[PDB]
Amino acid sequence: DFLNIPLTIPEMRLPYTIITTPPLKDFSLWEKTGLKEFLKTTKQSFDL
Amino acid sequence: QEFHMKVKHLIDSLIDFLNFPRFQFPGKPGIYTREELCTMFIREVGTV
């Protein structure tokens, strides 16, 4: 469930350079990448 | 003369390029600019 959380990443600045990383609004790796839809789940639960 | 012009312009650009970025350390909360962090380090070194 922590992966489904849309973490809001701000716009920081990398040291020793002028490259400014774009902010990431509502970043959910489990969902934005599309894995939630493919696996049709939000967690892992396997029984063997 | 052209070389001196290029050199002085490069120095002027480098001053901004060096005073532009900031820093963010885990032990020091918040983002510290170049001059503020430099002054804090000067004060800590001086008092120690």
Swiss-Prot record, chain B:
Its job: Apolipoprotein B is a major protein constituent of chylomicrons (apo B-48), LDL (apo B-100) and VLDL (apo B-100). Apo B-100 functions as a recognition signal for the cellular binding and internalization of LDL particles by the apoB/E receptor.
Name this protein carries in UniProt: Apolipoprotein B-100
Subcellular location: Cytoplasm; Secreted; Lipid droplet
Disease cited in the entry: Hypobetalipoproteinemia, familial, 1: A disorder of lipid metabolism characterized by less than 5th percentile age- and sex-specific levels of low density lipoproteins, and dietary fat malabsorption. Clinical presentation may vary from no symptoms to severe gastrointestinal and neurological dysfunction similar to abetalipoproteinemia.
Superkingdom classification of source: Eukaryota
Stimuli inducing this protein: Up-regulated in response to enterovirus 71 (EV71) infection (at protein level).
Post-translational modification: Palmitoylated; structural requirement for proper assembly of the hydrophobic core of the lipoprotein particle.
Organism: Homo sapiens (Human)
Record's subunit section: Interacts with PCSK9. Interacts with MTTP. Interacts with AUP1. Interacts with CIDEB.
